[PDB]
């Protein structure tokens, strides 16, 4: 088991902010960026080009911020500096809604699993809760993060119906989705939060951000596990779909750590500072890593032994 470069994705005319897979359509995955537009690739894999753009989502009027995919991978969920979230049809590659709500920027946005519920945090302290129709169902302001609310998750498990979420406010919260009340406060870091991502069983929550300390949550217990030491600003988090591994994009570099024996399996570098290595998304087969990176490339990095 080990990584190497594949190839890249030119495109994007600024920094890319998130990418998203979809295991319906395994040749297309969105990206979204700074350029104000999420990219729609098409997987060539060929000896010039490893994939090619598609299509070019246009309508945010600031940076996009996140994008998810839906689970039939007919839409795409995006967030912007704009204060707003946009459904996307990808077939006309249109705006089908607008959710307008927030105050200020939108950090992040996520789908539930079954699709009906849509979160997002924002610049403005809040975490939203809407249908698919752009109405605003709920919004926690109380004890909820007192400072930008950067990231906000679903976990997958359905006994315990929760949203997670991390702040500038240096904290991680559990919510319970049921009734959107705070569960727990996992205090410990000693910087803003960048990021959370949940393991694909629900057990498992990473948090990170400026300290450079990846966090591992028990989302059953409610209690803390272990941290692991990224040694640089941690940007971007996600657990592999098919292997016991957490992936970090800390600084420039991706530090990908097996979570077993708690040690590093690889850490992929581009061979004055260099470009910085800002989202993270593994391919429907679990065999490629994509990244995004402030130099508007999207590197593709492949599992060879």
Do not use: M
């Given at each position: 088991e080990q990584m190497t470069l594949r190839g890249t994705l030119k495109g994007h005319n600024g920094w890319v902010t998130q990418i998203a897979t979809t295991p319906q359509f395994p040749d297309m995955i969105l990206s979204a960026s700074r350029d104000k537009t999420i990219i729609m690739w098409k997987l060539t894999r060929d000896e010039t080009n490893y994939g090619i753009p598609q299509r070019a989502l246009r309508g945010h009027s600031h940076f996009v911020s996140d994008v998810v995919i839906s689970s039939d991978g007919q839409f795409a969920?995006?967030?912007?500096?704009?204060?707003?979230?946009?459904?996307?049809?990808?077939?006309?590659?249109?705006?089908?809604?607008?959710?307008?709500?927030?105050?200020?920027?939108?950090?992040?946005?996520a789908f539930s699993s079954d699709n009906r519920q849509i979160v997002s945090g924002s610049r403005d302290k809040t975490i939203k809760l809407?249908?698919?129709?752009?109405?605003?169902?709920?919004?926690?302001?109380?004890?909820?993060?007192?400072?930008?609310?950067?990231?906000?998750?679903?976990?997958?498990?359905?006994?315990?119906?929760?949203?997670?979420?991390?702040?500038?406010?240096?904290?991680?919260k559990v919510w319970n989705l049921a009734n959107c009340k705070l569960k727990t406060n996992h205090i410990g870091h000693t910087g803003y939060l960048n990021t959370v991502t949940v393991s694909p069983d629900g057990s498992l929550c990473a948090?990170?951000?400026?300290?450079?300390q990846a966090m591992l949550w028990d989302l059953n217990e409610?209690?803390?596990?272990?941290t692991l030491d990224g040694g640089d600003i941690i940007n971007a988090?996600?657990?592999?779909?098919?292997?016991?591994?957490?992936?970090?994009?800390?600084?420039?570099?991706?530090?990908?750590?097996?979570?077993?024996?708690?040690?590093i399996v690889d850490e992929l570098?581009?061979?004055?500072?260099?470009?910085?290595?800002?989202?993270?998304?593994?391919?429907?087969?679990g065999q490629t890593l994509?990244?995004?990176?402030?130099?508007?490339?999207?590197?593709?990095?492949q599992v060879t032994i």
């Open positions: 969920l995006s967030g912007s500096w704009d204060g707003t979230l946009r459904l996307w049809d990808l077939t006309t590659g249109t705006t089908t809604r607008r959710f307008v709500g927030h105050t200020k920027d939108v950090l992040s946005v809407w249908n698919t129709l752009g109405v605003c169902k709920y919004t926690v302001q109380d004890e909820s993060h007192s400072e930008w609310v950067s990231c906000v998750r679903f976990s997958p498990n359905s006994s315990n119906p929760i949203i997670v979420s991390c702040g500038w406010d240096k904290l991680v948090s990170g951000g400026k300290d450079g409610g209690k803390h596990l272990y988090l996600c657990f592999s779909p098919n292997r016991y591994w957490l992936c970090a994009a800390t600084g420039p570099s991706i530090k990908i750590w097996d979570l077993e024996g708690k040690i570098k581009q061979e004055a500072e260099p470009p910085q290595c800002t989202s993270l998304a593994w391919s429907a087969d994509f990244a995004g990176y402030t130099d508007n490339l999207v590197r593709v990095w």
